[PDB]
Design a protein around this motif. Sequence first.
Motif, PDB file in Angstrom:
ATOM      1  N   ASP A  21       0.834  -1.189   0.000  1.00  0.00           N
ATOM      2  CA  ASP A  21       0.000   0.000   0.000  1.00  0.00           C
ATOM      3  C   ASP A  21       0.875   1.246   0.000  1.00  0.00           C
ATOM      4  OD1 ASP A  21      -2.164   1.665   0.075  1.00  0.00           O
ATOM      5  OD2 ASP A  21      -2.817   1.125   2.084  1.00  0.00           O
ATOM      6  N   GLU A  40      -9.904   2.888  -9.882  1.00  0.00           N
ATOM      7  CA  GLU A  40      -9.382   3.963 -10.706  1.00  0.00           C
ATOM      8  C   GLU A  40      -8.017   3.583 -11.256  1.00  0.00           C
ATOM      9  OE1 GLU A  40      -9.413   7.364  -8.235  1.00  0.00           O
ATOM     10  OE2 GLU A  40     -11.586   7.653  -8.354  1.00  0.00           O
ATOM     11  N   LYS A  83      -3.658   2.944  -3.410  1.00  0.00           N
ATOM     12  CA  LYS A  83      -4.435   2.828  -2.182  1.00  0.00           C
ATOM     13  C   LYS A  83      -5.512   1.762  -2.355  1.00  0.00           C
ATOM     14  CE  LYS A  83      -4.032   4.884   1.039  1.00  0.00           C
ATOM     15  NZ  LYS A  83      -3.180   4.604   2.231  1.00  0.00           N
ATOM     16  N   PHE A  84      -6.203   1.459  -1.256  1.00  0.00           N
ATOM     17  CA  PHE A  84      -7.240   0.425  -1.215  1.00  0.00           C
ATOM     18  C   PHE A  84      -8.436   0.979  -0.453  1.00  0.00           C
ATOM     19  CE2 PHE A  84      -3.328  -1.943  -1.666  1.00  0.00           C
ATOM     20  CZ  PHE A  84      -3.653  -2.859  -2.642  1.00  0.00           C
ATOM     21  N   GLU A  85      -9.457   1.492  -1.146  1.00  0.00           N
ATOM     22  CA  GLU A  85     -10.456   2.175  -0.338  1.00  0.00           C
ATOM     23  C   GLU A  85     -11.508   1.222   0.219  1.00  0.00           C
ATOM     24  OE1 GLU A  85      -9.958   5.488   0.110  1.00  0.00           O
ATOM     25  OE2 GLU A  85      -8.244   5.409  -1.259  1.00  0.00           O
ATOM     26  N   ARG A  86     -12.582   0.984  -0.560  1.00  0.00           N
ATOM     27  CA  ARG A  86     -13.677   0.005  -0.426  1.00  0.00           C
ATOM     28  C   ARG A  86     -14.750   0.270  -1.483  1.00  0.00           C
ATOM     29  NH1 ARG A  86     -17.439   1.502   3.468  1.00  0.00           N
ATOM     30  NH2 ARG A  86     -17.350   3.674   4.205  1.00  0.00           N
ATOM     31  N   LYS A 134     -14.004  -4.509  -1.940  1.00  0.00           N
ATOM     32  CA  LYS A 134     -12.773  -3.736  -1.921  1.00  0.00           C
ATOM     33  C   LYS A 134     -12.446  -3.238  -3.323  1.00  0.00           C
ATOM     34  CE  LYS A 134     -10.825  -5.856   2.207  1.00  0.00           C
ATOM     35  NZ  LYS A 134     -10.688  -4.596   2.984  1.00  0.00           N
ATOM     36  N   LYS A 135     -11.345  -2.499  -3.423  1.00  0.00           N
ATOM     37  CA  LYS A 135     -11.051  -1.705  -4.604  1.00  0.00           C
ATOM     38  C   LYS A 135      -9.580  -1.326  -4.572  1.00  0.00           C
ATOM     39  CE  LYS A 135     -12.162   2.659  -4.680  1.00  0.00           C
ATOM     40  NZ  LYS A 135     -12.968   3.908  -4.616  1.00  0.00           N
ATOM     41  N   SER A 139      -7.285   1.735  -5.813  1.00  0.00           N
ATOM     42  CA  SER A 139      -7.255   3.098  -6.320  1.00  0.00           C
ATOM     43  C   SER A 139      -5.806   3.524  -6.502  1.00  0.00           C
ATOM     44  CB  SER A 139      -7.989   4.051  -5.377  1.00  0.00           C
ATOM     45  OG  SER A 139      -7.346   4.122  -4.119  1.00  0.00           O
ATOM     46  N   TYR A 160      -3.343   6.681  -7.940  1.00  0.00           N
ATOM     47  CA  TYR A 160      -3.340   8.099  -8.242  1.00  0.00           C
ATOM     48  C   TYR A 160      -1.990   8.532  -8.797  1.00  0.00           C
ATOM     49  CZ  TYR A 160      -7.639   8.272  -5.562  1.00  0.00           C
ATOM     50  OH  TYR A 160      -8.922   8.070  -5.107  1.00  0.00           O
TER      51      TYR A 160
END
Lengths: 82, 97, 64
Positions: free
Chosen positions: A25, A47, A66-69, A75-76, A78, A80
Motif C-alpha cells: 500500500d 481507478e 491505495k485500497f479504499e472500499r 474492496k477496490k 485506487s 493516483y
Amino acid sequence: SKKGVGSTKNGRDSEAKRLGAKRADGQFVTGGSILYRQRGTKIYPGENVGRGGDDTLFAKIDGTVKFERFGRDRKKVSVYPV
Amino acid sequence: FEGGQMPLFQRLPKRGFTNINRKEYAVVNLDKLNGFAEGTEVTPELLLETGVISKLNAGVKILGNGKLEKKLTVKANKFSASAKEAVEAAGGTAEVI
Amino acid sequence: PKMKTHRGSAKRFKKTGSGKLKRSHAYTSHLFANKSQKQKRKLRKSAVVSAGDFKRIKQMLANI
RNA sequence: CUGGGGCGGUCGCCUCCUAAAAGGUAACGGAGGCGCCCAAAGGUUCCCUCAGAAUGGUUGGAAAUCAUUCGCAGAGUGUAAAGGCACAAGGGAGCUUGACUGCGAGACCUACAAGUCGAGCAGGGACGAAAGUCGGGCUUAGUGAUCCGGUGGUUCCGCAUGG
RNA sequence: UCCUAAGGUAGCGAAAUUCCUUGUCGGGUAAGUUCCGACCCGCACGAAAGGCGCAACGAUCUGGGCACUGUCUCAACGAGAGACUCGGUGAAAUUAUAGUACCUGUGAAGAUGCAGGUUACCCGCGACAGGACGGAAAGACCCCGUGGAGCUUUACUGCAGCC
RNA sequence: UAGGCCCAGGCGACUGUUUAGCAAAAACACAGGUCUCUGCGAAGCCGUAAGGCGAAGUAUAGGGGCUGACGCCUGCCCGGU
RNA sequence: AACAGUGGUAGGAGAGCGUUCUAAGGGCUGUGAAGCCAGACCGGAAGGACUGGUGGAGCGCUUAGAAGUGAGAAUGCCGGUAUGAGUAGCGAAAGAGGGGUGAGAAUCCCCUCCACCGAAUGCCUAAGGUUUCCUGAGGAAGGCUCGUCCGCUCAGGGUUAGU
RNA sequence: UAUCCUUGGGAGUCAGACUGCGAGUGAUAAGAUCCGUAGUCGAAAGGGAAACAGCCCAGACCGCCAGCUAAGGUCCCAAAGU
RNA sequence: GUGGGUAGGGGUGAAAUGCCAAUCGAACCUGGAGAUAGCUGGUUCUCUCCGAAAUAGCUUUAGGGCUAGCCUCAAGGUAAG
RNA sequence: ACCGAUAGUGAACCAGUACCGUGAGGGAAAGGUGAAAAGCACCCCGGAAGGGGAGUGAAAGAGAUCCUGAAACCGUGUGCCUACAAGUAGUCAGAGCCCGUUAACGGGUGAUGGCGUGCCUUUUGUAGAAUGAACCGGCGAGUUACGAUCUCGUGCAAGGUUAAGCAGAAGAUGCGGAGCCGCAGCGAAAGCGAGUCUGAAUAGGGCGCAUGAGUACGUGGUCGUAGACCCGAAACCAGGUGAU
RNA sequence: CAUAGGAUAUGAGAAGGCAGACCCGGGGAACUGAAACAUCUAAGUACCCGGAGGAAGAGAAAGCAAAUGCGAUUCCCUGAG
C-alpha cells in the motif's frame, strides 16, 4: 511377521500458484506492473486499474496505490498520479 | 553435467548453419586514416605494413564511424554508404577496387 | 594437448559480443496445437543463458 | 519411491484442507478431478430473471406444463474443486468470426528450462449510431524438452561456375 | 443346471505329501504329538515326473521286545599319558598408555576409568572361566552399488549351425 | 581273536558310485520296459574345411529322450504349444 | 596514539618456520665440522642458537630460485625388538647297571642280561634321492635336550661285467 | 547504528539432533516420525542440574597468590546466614 | 604299478555343479593395467584473519550429483541495509 | 639447481643367483678396519670359544657383517619416594629430604589436596561396549605435461607477439610476420554496418556503442585431456604353461 | 610316344635368433568412458603372425586449387580444436 497395509488413495496435491498481495500500500508503482493475483475477482479494479483476462490487477498509470472500499463489503484498488 | 537431469545443451534447439563461402572483411574504423596526411595512397598493401590492418582476410571494407578531414586517394574492395560520402566530405576520391 | 569445444554446445549458442551467451527458446520443435498464439510470438525470439547456468558451462565454449 | 526390503499402493498436472489471519513447507496425512469439450457453450449488440414453496386448477399422481404471489439467491454457472457472480460471469435473440498477424515499456513467479500478466502501438477487421470492447471460452487443469525424419511457403546457401 | 479340447477310471489314502491337527476310532504303554491297523470334508495322491503289492538285500530309515550292560539315578576306585614340581631347551595368536575392586545412577541408551557411596595391607602359585561387547574371519544372513559372475525362457538385439 | 538276535514299517529291487578335505542316502547307475530319430558317406558328435571316431559295425545294429528287476497294471482330453 | 574486536569444524584468505639442491658475496673448519648425546638459553609458533661430551670430514649464514617439501594413525611396507614367560610344546615305543673314552657325559663306545616287532619295526630290488656309503680328525652353529658322538662341517678313500 | 547490492576467483554443505509453544501421522504412546517459527548443540570450553552435546545461566587473545555480579546455592562433604 | 591321450568360453563326470596339482558356478601365470570403484580406510609444519550448512527444486536419483540458498577473498557503485 | 645402499637398474656385493613353484612364472636379502695388514708375536685363564695384560697404529672403546652408532628393548648401580590405598596416571597447590645450572621469581623427588574419562577416523551424537595401531626407526598421499580462465605483477600499447627452422657451448641472443588474439558488431544466412536482424512498418522491442583497452609472458587459484590423490576390489579379455 | 616318378651331380641358395626399440601388411579383443548397456567410445592400441631395412613405408601427378598457377613424396609449425 508384519501385516502388509496399503491403500493410500489420497497421496496427491497440486502445486499452488502464488496468490496474495504483491505491491504494498502507498508504494510508487510504475505502469503496467501487477498489484495482486486472485482466483475470482475479490478485489475489483477501481481507478486507473483494469481487470485482466485472468482477472488479476494491473496498473494503467504511474504513482501511488491505495485500497479504499466499495461500500458494503467489497474492496477496490485506487491508483493516483503525482 | 547435472546428475541425470537433461543438461542444458540439449533441451535447446539447433539453429546453426555454416557456409564455406564467407568473407571476413578487414575492419577499418575510417579514423586510422587520420594517422596519415592528406593526399596519400590508400591501398590494402599499404594498410598492412603501416600497422593499420594486421591481417588481410580477402577483403578490406571501410566503415563510417567517426570523421575525416583529409583528402585521400582511397581505393578498396567494398564501402559502407556513409563512408563513401565521408571521404567525399573531405574531398577525397572513393575508388572501388 | 589442447582443449576441445563441447561440440553440441557450440551448434546451439552464438557467443554474443560483450561477454554474453545467446540461445534459442525450447518447446518449439513439433507440438503446436496445444500452445496458444501468445506463446508463439514469445518463443521465436532468442534469449540469454541465465547467470546460474553460465557458471557451469562457461568452460565448454570458451573457444568461440 | 519405501518407518528393513518383498509383494501390494503411487509416480506429472488442477482445486481444497492441513498452513500456524502475506507467499511458500513435508508425511505411504484427509477429500474429488484431468489426457477434454464447444462452430456456440466464443465476439459484440440489445434483451431479463432464478431455486423451491404456496395456492388455483383435465389427463396429472409426490413430482410434466399454465398463471398467481412470497421470493438478493437456496439455483444456474460446458467439467472437479475453491474463489466469485444477480449492475451479470446467469438466461435469450440478431449479426458476425478477435479461436486476428507483427508486437509489447513493465512486472509476478522462478535454481534452470518453462509458465503467468498487460497497458499501449501498427496493419487489417467484426459488432454498434457512437463511445468503446474483442489477441478464444467465469478464472485456475485438459498434456511434454531436444535430437529426429514427414509436410506447405521461402529477395537463404549450395564445394570451379550454372542448377 | 451352466462351462470345457476333456472333466481323475483301476489301485492306494492324515502319506517322505495333511494346512486346521496331536483329525476321529482301535492295538502297542501304567502314560504313546512319533510307529502299525482301518475311516475318508484326498487344503495339494494318481498311473512310465509313473501307480500299487513284493520274498531276497542295506555302516539307510522310523517303531516295538528279549539278551546284556556306569548310559542313568549316584558316583567310587585303580593303572598309565599330559597336568603341578627340580635341572635341559623354549615359541605363538594377541597387545593405545596402564598402580586396572562393585554396587547403584547416568551416558552413543549393557562400565575397570567419570559421579554417589561401599569395601579392600604388598607380592606370587595351583584351579574355575562370569566379564573386558574376550581373540582368530573389514558378516556368511540383510539392504544399497546404477557393482559382478554362473543359470534361465514366450525380456531385447545378435551370432554359430542346420534350413 | 574271530555273527548280537527277533517282530513289523515305508523308501529304494538288487552287488555297485559320487558330495578328495561337512553331507554314502530315499540320489545316481543298473538289467528289463519303451516312443522316436537313422538305408550306410547313416543319424548324433568333435567342430568353419580335411581326416577317419560311430564301426575293420550295418534296423536282432547305433546315437537320443523318458522311466527303473520281476508280478498286476499304464484310463480320459489333439483346443493352446 | 585513540577506539574496537580476537572460540571455531568443514571452508576461504594472509603471513612465516624448516630440510635437500643451486646462484652470487661473506666466513669456518685437524687449534676438531656434519651428525650424535645431554641440559636450567632465547624467539608469539613451527623454532633457533650456546657451552659440555662424543665422533674424524665437511657445512652454515644474507638474499634469491628449483622442489621426490615436514608423519603419529592406510586390518600400511620393511627391518630391529618386546608381550604372553621361562609359560605351552619337547613327534607314539623299556631299559638299568658296570668298565672305557674324555675338560665335561641320563644319551657316546663296549660287555652283561632283561626288552620289542617278526606277512615285519627282518633280508634282496624298482621309483627317486645325489655322496648321505667308507675310514681319519673337528665340535661355533644343523638335531625340538645336552653331546666326547652323526644322515653335520672338514681332508682322504670307495662302484670293475660277454651272460 | 553500518550493512547491502553488483561483477569476478574459490568453496564446503545437501544423513542432523533435542527442549518449549503452533499442527499432522500415532493410541492427543516414543529420547518416534513430518514440518512451522525460536533457541542452543553441531562448530562452544566455563558454572549449576550429583555425573550429562541437545534444558537453565554465559561466550575462552594470553598472564596475576586482585575486585563485582547471573543461574544455582549458604548444617557437613562442597565456598557462603544454624 | 608302468607307458601315453583329452586344456579352460574347454576337458572330464554310474552326476556332486565334484574333480582339472592343498585352488573350480569357469583353473594357473605374466600381459592390456597405476583397469574401474558415485564405496571404505589414509592425506604429514605453525600462527593470525573472518567463517557456514544438513533445506528447496530436478535427477534410475534418494548415502551421489548440478543449479539457487547460507560463507570467505577482490573490485565497485556508495549509505542505499 | 639426478640417486647416495629401504635411494638409484630386481641386481653397487658372484643377481636373475640364493630360495618359492612339477609348471608358464615369481623373485629377495647383504657396501664402508686404516693412510699403510703394519691384522695382534709374547704372558696368563680355559679343551677351546672368549678375554685381561702387553705390543701395533695418531686412535684397539679401530681388532674381523671392522666409520659414525639414536630409539625400541635388555640392563648394573645408586640420589629421593612407597607395603590403608582405589584413581587415562597428569596438572596445579604443596611441606620434608636430596641439590648447585646456558645464575634465575633454580634442579630432582615428591607424603597429601582440588579439578579431572587417551589420541585418530566416522558421526545428529563417541572416553566408548564402533573402527585403527605391540611399541621403535625409515619410506609412504593432491605432482608435472599441455590448454582454458581469473586475480596479482611485468613491458609496449589502439597494436601486442612470433612457431618451426638457421647460426650460435643444449644455452643467451640474432634471423624468421606464416598464423592467432585485439582494435565493430548484429543476422542461421546472403548481405549490411554505428547500426543490425524480425517486420509491411522512418513503429516498437532483441542484442550492439555510445562511458575504447588489449596482448605477450611469469608467480600463484582452479579447470579440460592425461594412471591425474593415494592404497583396494570381485571381475571381464588376449597369449600361453600344466591330467607326476 | 611322352610325362609322373626315380637316380646322380653342381649350388658362402634358404632355415634359425634378438636388441622387451623402431615400420609394414594379414588376423584381432576387453574391462573402463557414455555416470546403466548394444551402435558408439576404449583403438584398430594390448598381445599374437609374417616381412625386412638400418631406417622402413610412400613417392615424378588420372594431385591441389579456382588465380591472371603451382609442380614427385615424407616430416615439422600453423591451419584448429
